[PDB]
Ligand binder design. Structure first.
Ligand code: CLA
Ligand code: CLA
Ligand code: CLA
Ligand code: CLA
Ligand code: CLA
Ligand code: CLA
Ligand code: CLA
Ligand SMILES: CCCCCCCCCCCCCCCC(=O)OC[C@H](COP(=O)(O)OC[C@@H](O)CO)OC(=O)CCCCCCCCCCCCCCC
Ligand SMILES: CC1=C(/C=C/C(C)=C/C=C/C(C)=C/C=C/C=C(C)/C=C/C=C(C)/C=C/C2=C(C)CCCC2(C)C)C(C)(C)CCC1
Ligand SMILES: CC1=C(C/C=C(\C)CCC[C@H](C)CCC[C@H](C)CCCC(C)C)C(=O)c2ccccc2C1=O
Ligand SMILES: CC1=C(C/C=C(\C)CCC[C@H](C)CCC[C@H](C)CCCC(C)C)C(=O)c2ccccc2C1=O
Ligand code: SF4
Ligand code: SF4
Ligand code: SF4
Lengths: 31, 80, 161, 96, 739, 43, 97, 141
């Protein structure tokens, strides 16, 4: 099942930092 | 802001008041020393942490001391 | 090439207050430049904030088909232009995030320069910046399709003209 | 109010910034014996008037750095205010 | 208008006894070891003492005789060492094989192995300074002409040293003698430059070019007559140079075409020596000389006629710049740093132009033949030119602090760059960033594409062209200029643009340099590292007096460490510290210029010509596909060319093996001063003074750590010394082996 | 006395340390021309 | 320019380590007060640019503090010291066996 | 022996380095006289003399002889410099005499101190060598 690399690596490469940075930027800039 | 502690060892030299560029320091009368005045810091929200006031004090060790604290806009020296 | 003519000057200061940190130069207030910048869709009078981002999205989504399709990795293959379409659409979405990420962070008020005497009043509210963000994704995707439609058959439009 | 003349210079890029609209803004007034050339702490040279002057500065640090430059002109009358964006003018220099 | 004071300063050994007599604070005696370093620092800073500009200027003019003595002692030393300890008379017989050598080493500790065999039965250090090309270019034939020159230099070194005593301690000028800058420019442009090049034009025509023409025939060295017999026996200036029997009258009847044998316009390289034609240099320095004597009659003196510089500058003003150049006369006639900033940024920029105009147009007999000489003349004057531009930036920041005046400099072009200094820097900040990505990131792009096995995605001559259109065009104009836009020439100004391959023996003198994709990247690396260096130096000039951070920076001084830990931290705000940071980028910028040179010339110019005209280069022609990746700069330049410097033990290149490692040391040693701070090292001495207090070896002069400014200055002086000496020992041992 | 200023100049810090380190270095150099290669004492 | 092999990561990481190492000198030779006077010109030329001053920071840009870029300077120094030798230790041994 | 140490006079590697001697000084046989003295050392497998810092009296010329010769000199450098700083402390200037040497005081200090092992014990046994710890400045703890 070597096709899981095609679906975990782009999520951790792209989706994981986009979801993390967009959470943290809205959390540090929160009155 | 920062914290300006003035101990009881100074002589009223008025070198620290004539060196703080945001004019935090001022002389108040005080019957202790020979010149009969001690430095006082009533406006420490304006202090920028320059430590020009520690450089100009004669006494060993320094009667004035600047403790660097939380840095607001006036103490960062930001024109913006 | 004497202007007024041996005299006088152009760097009179901004708004006749020299103690403000700005000046009026031939790049600031030359009335062809001031007319141009005031009439970009970010600054034009009489526009909905959805209407402002609709032209801005169609313009920025248009040329971003360019560098992906002709410099990307697939630029020798049969999918040379489709690789530039997915890259351009795929990067407007990264800009649609950054507009919505900027808008939701309680954004500061927009500036008022010397070539533009007012911010356009739709750029001080979270709801105002969100309409600009929703328009940018619609116009950005559509502006990249019409760049994909024209360049994919360059021999046909030139024969049909 | 303040009611001072503005010195002669062609404008600077230093000047005042967005803080002068938003957080605070200072202003130094001095009554000059004559008209002569001094320096701006924003940058460059200027020309004071005769009588009461006025210079809107960015920070308090500028007006006391300027007041030392005015001391070698026999001008020891400079008074810095703190002009808040709500219109609240606060006399801060000197203490009395 | 010469007025001269009579005996201002008595000549005595009084002030040699007490040290540090010059400053009132520093003369009271030492208390710490800070006094020891301030004596050597404030020594030649004559401006800090008084306000009397008359008194300072006399010290400045007399010390300038001191530096003229030590250059003449140096220069007559190089002729004297080349008279006794050289193979100059064996070099003249065969410059194609005998290596230029002086400096015979004393044989004491086994350092006699440095006296290697250079050819001609002579053992010594193969020099690279190129003095044998100069002396042949002067026309020196035997040793006795080198003795009387060197002995003549030692007399001329004594007149400079005597006049420095005389014009200070005995007869010193007044102030107004110095401020006659109209009278100075008339004497210095005419008599020094114009009459100096007119007299030297007389030396090629009557002396040098007759000898260098007899050398090119291959006659002999001894059989060529003495050069004063060329003036006496006029029959030998008519066997060669036949346009000489007409004599002096074609000069005065304007029949200047009669002189067409020895004031030519050949325009190219001599096929025998690989140098310039000696007749072209004769018509050069003569035509140079006429222009200077005319243009030195420009400025007004005691006789009414002439331009006035206070009236030239104040007319040139426009609508944009207000009062224009009104007020810049008083800056340049009162301040000495304003002169020193101007005469040093434009003489340092001149020295780099000299380096470019001497590798392509080699002006000496057998200069391009010796690859070991031509590489080192370029890389020498590159660095000498680069330090002076930083110095002009340094002494301009000193002008802004001490000598700037608001009253004079009101609304002129000096004032108008301090109003918009935020617009100058931030638009310069953008270009330094823009050139950083679009020039260096195209190497990082090519590093990654070759590592990922994608060679078709690279910016190379094969995959993605970046051809330098605007410099491939200018080469095609300078190739086609003979017959066209300059019809009187024959070949171009040099063969670096076009033309053909000129071989001298086997080695290439000069070949057409072809610019390509790798040459596009490295010329835009050069623009990047120069605009960043300007960014640091100009920021120290514009923000010398104040900024938004420090409104009273000129109150503190030119050279102060910081303004305390406040405002976030204000360390390295001074105008001194921007000179400190620019010395690294000057080191960074000039190291790539001399790396571009040392590998473009080996890969695409230098080499050996075969019989059929095939040019076999040194490195086989690999600059094209390897100077586009940082791996290629590491593999094929630093790694591959160091195989002659580290394998050089047990041979004559052993000292370059020791200076290669020894300069890696001093470079690494400098980081102890740069990284660490002063306040650590003062605490450590307190624990060493204790062990010195315990055994009663307490020094009366208290030890202190080096100051904050000095710890930066020691850390950049040891940095620049070990970084350049690495390259000094790397260029020599590579090119004294493959040349 | 002009001659006393020359004794007082020859005994400053860099001038005495130049002469003394020249005499020191010259002893090591002229000992090594005549008796070279002394790695260890021969016993 | 002839090709690649299995050592091309370690050849790339070796150059990568020389670059992280050299980057950390910038935080150590140059100190803070040069950089706060540089950022104050970028704060100026962002409030004056006519289209790009629609957006504006929430946090005012200041330069890195004195203790901070001794951390950040030592971080680029130490990471580059490790990665340079670890690319040389492996590939000089795994290329020779 | 020693160890991994054959004598140099028995090694074929040392005698191979003997045939290609390089002259140290302009003495034409300085390459040859170098190796007749290195024949008594212990050359390993390479042909180079390996020294013995042990204390063995047959290998005393390596380190035992130069250690005595060094420590007499370098202690005398520091003994003279100690006795001069004691002298100029009791004078009027005390900092002129540090950079600008009192040569009339310095030269009697230099010529005297060659018997410093006879001297430096006498300050030790009388306790004048050191100072009291209640008389030296110390840092706050
Ligand atoms: C670790 C995560 C990761 C992954 C999985 C990839 C994957 C890829 N990169 Mg890459 N990249 C990364 C990190 C990563 N990168 C980083 C950190 C950098 C900075 C140094 C780069 C810089 C970089 C450049 C400069 C380029 C790539 C390119 C590519 C593509 C090469 C294959 C190809 O021919 O494209 C074929 C496929 C296409 C041309 C289009 C595919 C569709 C796109 C990806 C998205 C479509 C819409 C999407 C579904 C929704 C919006 C996007 C979403 C992320 C929000 C591939 C998709 C090349 C490329 O094509 O980029 C577009 C290219 O030019 N990368
Ligand atoms: C002097 C300027 C000028 C030019 C360059 C043209 C050019 C043309 N005309 Mg023409 N025309 C003109 C003036 C001009 N006309 C005037 C003054 C009149 C009034 C009497 C006419 C009346 C006229 C008629 C009635 C017709 C033309 C047609 C044509 C086209 C014939 C070629 C063909 O087969 O089309 C092949 C090309 C196409 C069918 C489509 C080409 C793409 C179009 C032009 C625009 C695409 C979108 C564009 C880029 C953006 C929006 C438009 C933009 C102008 C705002 C050609 C494009 C014929 C035609 O095809 O018209 C459409 C036609 O039927 N013309
Ligand atoms: C043990 C260390 C040592 C000692 C005592 C000397 C001593 C000497 N060297 Mg020497 N040298 C040394 C190491 C040493 N060297 C090393 C390591 C190198 C290689 C970098 C050299 C390279 C060298 C050169 C190239 C020259 C000297 C010269 C000299 C002599 C005069 C010094 C001078 O230039 O003035 C002097 C006898 C000079 C000389 O021989 O005078 C003619 C000279 O020109 N040395
Ligand atoms: C025409 C040449 C020239 C002249 C006349 C001056 C003159 C002056 N400069 Mg200036 N300068 C120059 C070029 C020049 N400079 C250049 C090219 C630079 C760039 C590097 C500078 C950078 C500079 C700075 C940054 C400063 C000056 C200062 C000064 C003033 C005092 C200098 C002093 O007393 O030094 C005394 C002499 C020394 C301290 C000795 C320094 C020794 C150097 C660092 C080492 C040399 C390395 C050597 C080649 C290798 C030796 C190897 C070793 C093993 C022996 C004086 C007016 C200072 C000042 O305050 O002005 C008012 C000041 O702050 N200058
Ligand atoms: C190798 C070391 C190194 C590097 C990279 C830099 C980099 C820089 N220095 Mg610098 N500096 C250094 C050493 C270095 N310095 C040292 C040793 C000193 C001590 C004297 C200084 C002193 C110094 C001063 C005094 C100044 C600079 C300035 C600059 C900037 C120039 C603008 C530029 O080219 O940026 C462009 C960036 C690069 C060339 C780096 C390559 C980046 C690539 C192309 C892109 C990144 C790849 C990828 C997309 C990353 C994303 C991956 C993702 C997963 C996160 C830049 C930040 C100047 C400045 O800031 O003004 C402009 C300035 O004034 N530096
Ligand atoms: C440091 C002090 C010092 C000492 C103690 C000596 C000692 C000696 N030198 Mg001497 N020398 C010195 C410095 C010194 N040198 C210096 C600095 C130079 C360079 C100018 C010379 C140049 C020199 C020459 C040229 C000669 C001596 C010779 C001699 C020897 C004969 C006695 C004499 O003094 O003459 C003797 C061993 C002579 C000798 O015996 O050599 C063959 C000899 O010819 N010396
Ligand atoms: C700090 C470590 C160190 C040590 C322990 C040594 C030790 C030695 N070196 Mg070495 N050397 C060093 C650093 C060192 N060196 C450095 C840094 C360099 C580079 C500059 C050299 C370069 C060098 C060379 C080129 C040579 C030496 C030589 C020597 C030997 C001295 C020969 C001689 O006649 O002296 C003995 C001297 C005396 C006995 C005179 C003292 C007499 C006193 C004044 C009498 C006192 C009476 C009471 C000795 C083994 C020489 C040698 O023979 O190599 C083995 C030699 O040719 N060394
Ligand atoms: C453009 C070349 C140029 O020199 O323009 C010329 C122009 C000034 O021209 P003027 O003829 O007004 O100059 C009068 C004096 O400068 C010469 O006497 O410069 C500026 O306005 C500032 C230049 C900003 C440069 C931006 C880059
Ligand atoms: C100022 C100027 C300039 C610049 C300019 C430019 C360059 C511009 C750009 C341009 C561009 C940038 C363009 C754009 C345009 C746009 C367009 C053309 C678009 C289109 C679109 C469309 C058509 C779409 C549609 C749609 C939608 C919206 C949605 C749905 C879908 C569809 C598809 C339907 C120049 C240089 C000339 C010079 C000087 C002046
Ligand atoms: C080493 C070092 C010191 C200490 C270094 C000092 C005090 C210099 C001492 C070196 C010289 C060589 C000592 C010379 C002492 C005598 C004058 C020489 C005695 C020998 C004579 C014969 C010459 C600092 O104070 C410092 C401060 C800030 C940043 C970095 C550093 C730093 O790296
Ligand atoms: C470059 C530099 C700056 C300016 C640099 C700044 C203000 C930051 C530059 C980096 C920007 C913010 C981008 C950061 C991106 C990093 C490569 C990765 C960030 C991700 C981590 C934070 C997780 C200073 O202010 C400074 C102060 C004192 C000593 C040295 C220096 C110094 O060297
Ligand atoms: S704190 Fe210092 S400056 Fe202030 S009164 Fe005391 S001694 Fe004087
Ligand atoms: S922080 Fe220090 S330097 Fe600044 S005003 Fe206060 S006492 Fe003066
Ligand atoms: S140089 Fe040192 S003392 Fe001065 S501000 Fe910087 S860190 Fe503080």
């Amino acid at each position: 099942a070597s096709f899981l690399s095609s679906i975990f690596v782009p999520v951790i490469g792209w989706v994981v930092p986009i979801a993390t940075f967009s959470f943290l930027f809205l959390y540090i800039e929160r009155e | 802001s920062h914290t300006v502690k003035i101990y009881d060892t100074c002589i009223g030299c008025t070198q620290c008041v004539r060196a703080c560029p945001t004019d935090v320091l001022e002389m108040v009368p005080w019957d202790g020393c020979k010149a009969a005045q001690v430095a006082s810091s009533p406006r420490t929200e304006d202090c920028v942490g320059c430590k020009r006031c520690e450089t100009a004090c004669p006494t060993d060790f320094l009667s004035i001391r600047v403790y660097l604290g939380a840095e607001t806009t006036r103490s960062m020296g930001l024109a913006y | 090439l004497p202007s007024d003519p041996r005299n006088r000057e152009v760097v009179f200061p901004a708004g006749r207050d020299p103690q403000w940190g700005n000046l009026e130069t031939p790049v600031n207030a030359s009335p062809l430049v001031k007319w141009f910048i005031n009439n970009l869709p970010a600054y034009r009078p009489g526009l909905t904030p959805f209407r402002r981002g609709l032209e801005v999205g169609m313009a920025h989504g248009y040329f971003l088909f360019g560098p992906f399709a002709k410099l990307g990795p697939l630029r020798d293959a049969a999918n040379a232009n489709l690789a530039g379409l997915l890259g351009a659409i795929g990067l407007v979405v990264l800009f649609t995030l950054a507009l919505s990420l900027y808008a939701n962070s309680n954004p500061p008020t927009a500036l008022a320069s010397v070539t533009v005497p007012n911010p356009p009043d739709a750029f001080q509210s979270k709801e105002g910046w969100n309409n600009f963000a929703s328009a940018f994704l619609i116009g950005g995707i559509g502006g990249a399709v019409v760049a994909y439609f024209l360049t994919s058959n360059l021999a046909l439009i030139q024969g049909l003209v | 109010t303040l009611s001072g003349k503005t010195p002669l210079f062609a404008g600077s890029t230093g000047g005042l910034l967005t803080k002068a609209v938003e957080e605070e803004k200072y202003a130094i007034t001095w009554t000059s014996p004559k008209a002569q050339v001094f320096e701006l702490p924003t940058g460059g040279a200027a020309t004071m008037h005769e009588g009461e002057n006025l210079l809107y500065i960015a920070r308090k640090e500028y007006g006391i750095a300027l007041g030392g430059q005015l001391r070698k002109f026999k001008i020891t009358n400079y008074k810095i205010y703190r002009i808040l964006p709500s219109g609240e003018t606060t006399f801060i220099h000197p203490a009395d | 208008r010469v007025i001269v004071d009579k005996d201002p300063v008595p000549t005595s050994f009084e002030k040699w006894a007490q040290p540090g007599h010059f400053d009132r604070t520093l003369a009271r005696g030492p208390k710490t070891t800070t006094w020891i370093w301030n004596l050597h620092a404030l020594a030649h800073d004559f401006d800090t003492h008084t306000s009397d500009l008359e008194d300072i200027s006399r010290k400045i003019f007399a010390a300038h005789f001191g530096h003229l003595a030590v250059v003449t002692i140096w220069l007559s030393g190089m002729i004297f060492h080349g008279a006794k300890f050289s193979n100059y008379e064996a070099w003249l017989s065969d410059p194609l094989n005998v290596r230029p050598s002086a400096q015979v080493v004393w044989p004491i500790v086994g350092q006699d192995i440095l006296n290697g065999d250079v050819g001609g039965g002579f053992h010594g250090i193969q020099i690279t300074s190129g003095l044998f090309q100069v002396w042949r270019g002067w026309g020196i034939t035997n040793s006795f002409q080198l003795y009387c020159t060197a002995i003549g230099g030692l007399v001329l070194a004594g007149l400079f040293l005597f006049a420095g005593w005389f014009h200070y301690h005995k007869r010193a000028p007044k102030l107004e003698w110095f401020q006659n800058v109209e009278s100075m420019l008339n004497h210095h442009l005419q008599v020094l430059l114009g009459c100096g090049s007119l007299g030297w034009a007389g030396h090629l025509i009557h002396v040098s070019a007759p000898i260098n023409k007899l050398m090119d025939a291959g006659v002999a060295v001894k059989d060529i007559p003495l050069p004063h017999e060329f003036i006496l026996n006029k029959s030998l200036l008519i066997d060669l140079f036949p346009g000489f029997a007409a004599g002096l009258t074609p000069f005065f009847t304007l029949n200047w075409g009669q002189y067409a044998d020895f004031l030519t316009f050949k325009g190219g390289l001599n096929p025998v020596t690989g140098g310039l034609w000696m007749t072209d240099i004769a018509h050069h320095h003569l035509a140079i000389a006429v222009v200077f004597i005319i243009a030195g009659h420009q400025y007004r003196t005691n006789w009414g006629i002439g331009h006035s510089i206070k009236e030239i500058l104040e007319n040139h003003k426009g609508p944009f710049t207000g009062e224009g150049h009104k007020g810049l006369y008083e800056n340049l006639t009162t301040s000495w740093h304003a002169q020193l900033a101007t005469n040093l940024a434009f003489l340092g920029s001149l020295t780099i132009i000299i380096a470019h105009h001497m590798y392509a147009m080699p002006p000496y007999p057998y200069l391009a033949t010796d690859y070991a000489t031509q590489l080192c003349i370029f890389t020498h004057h590159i660095w000498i030119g680069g330090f002076l531009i930083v110095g002009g930036a340094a002494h301009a920041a000193i002008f802004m602090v001490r000598d700037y005046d608001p009253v004079v400099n009101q609304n002129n072009v000096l004032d108008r760059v301090i109003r918009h200094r935020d617009a100058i820097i931030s638009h310069l900040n953008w270009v330094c960033i823009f050139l950083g990505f679009h020039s260096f990131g195209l190497y990082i792009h090519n590093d990654t594409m070759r590592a990922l096995g994608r060679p078709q995605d690279m910016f190379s001559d094969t995959a993605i062209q970046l051809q330098p259109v605007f410099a491939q065009w200018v080469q095609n104009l300078h190739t086609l200029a003979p017959g066209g836009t300059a019809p009187n020439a024959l070949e171009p100004v040099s063969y670096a643009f076009g033309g053909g391959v000129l071989a001298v023996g086997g080695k290439v003198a000069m070949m057409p340099i072809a610019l390509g994709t790798a040459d596009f990247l490295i010329h835009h690396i050069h623009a990047f590292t120069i605009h960043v260096t300007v960014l640091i130096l100009l920021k120290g000039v514009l923000f010398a007096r104040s900024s938004r951070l420090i409104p009273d920076k000129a109150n503190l001084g030119f050279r102060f460490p910081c303004d305390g830990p406040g405002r976030g931290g204000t360390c390295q705000v001074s105008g001194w510290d921007h000179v400190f940071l620019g010395l690294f980028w000057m080191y960074n910028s000039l190291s790539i210029v001399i790396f571009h040179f040392s590998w473009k010339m080996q890969s695409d110019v230098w080499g050996t010509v075969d019989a059929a005209g095939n040019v076999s280069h040194i490195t086989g022609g690999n600059f094209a596909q390897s100077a586009i990746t940082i791996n290629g700069w590491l593999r094929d330049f630093l790694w591959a060319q160091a195989s002659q410097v580290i394998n050089s033990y047990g041979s004559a290149l052993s000292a370059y093996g020791l200076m290669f490692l020894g300069a890696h040391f001093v470079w690494a040693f400098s980081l102890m001063f740069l990284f660490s701070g002063r306040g650590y090292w003062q605490e450590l001495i307190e624990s060493i003074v204790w062990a010195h207090n315990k055994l009663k070896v307490a020094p009366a002069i208290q030890p202190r750590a080096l100051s904050i400014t000095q710890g930066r200055a020691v850390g950049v002086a040891h940095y620049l010394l070990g970084g350049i000496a690495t390259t000094w020992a790397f260029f020599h041992a590579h090119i004294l082996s493959v040349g | 006395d002009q001659s006393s200023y020359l004794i007082k100049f020859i005994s400053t810090a860099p001038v005495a340390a130049t002469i003394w380190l020249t005499i020191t270095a010259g002893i090591l150099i002229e000992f090594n021309r005549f008796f070279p290669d002394l790695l260890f004492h021969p016993l | 320019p002839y090709g690649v092999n299995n050592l091309s990561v370690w050849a790339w990481m070796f150059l990568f380590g020389h670059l992280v190492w050299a980057t950390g000198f910038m935080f150590l030779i140059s100190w803070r007060g040069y950089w706060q006077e540089l950022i104050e010109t970028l704060v100026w030329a962002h409030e004056r640019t006519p289209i790009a001053n629609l957006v504006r920071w929430k946090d005012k840009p200041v330069a890195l503090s004195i203790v901070q870029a001794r951390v950040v300077g030592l971080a680029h120094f130490t990471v580059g010291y490790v990665l340079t030798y670890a690319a040389f230790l492996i590939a000089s041994t795994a290329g020779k066996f | 022996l020693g160890a991994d140490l054959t004598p140099c006079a028995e090694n074929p590697a040392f005698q191979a380095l003997a045939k290609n001697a390089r002259n140290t000084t302009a003495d034409p046989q300085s390459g040859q006289k170098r190796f007749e003295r290195y024949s008594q050392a212990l050359c390993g497998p390479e042909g180079y003399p390996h020294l013995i810092v042990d204390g063995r009296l047959d290998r005393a010329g390596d380190f035992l002889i130069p250690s005595i010769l060094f420590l007499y000199i370098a202690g005398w450098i520091g003994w003279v410099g100690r006795a001069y700083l004691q002298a100029i402390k009791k004078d009027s200037d005390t900092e002129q005499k540090e950079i600008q040497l009192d040569l009339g005081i310095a030269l009697p200090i230099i010529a005297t101190g060659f018997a410093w092992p006879a001297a430096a014990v006498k300050e030790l046994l009388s306790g004048e060598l050191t100072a009291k710890d209640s008389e030296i400045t110390v840092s706050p703890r």
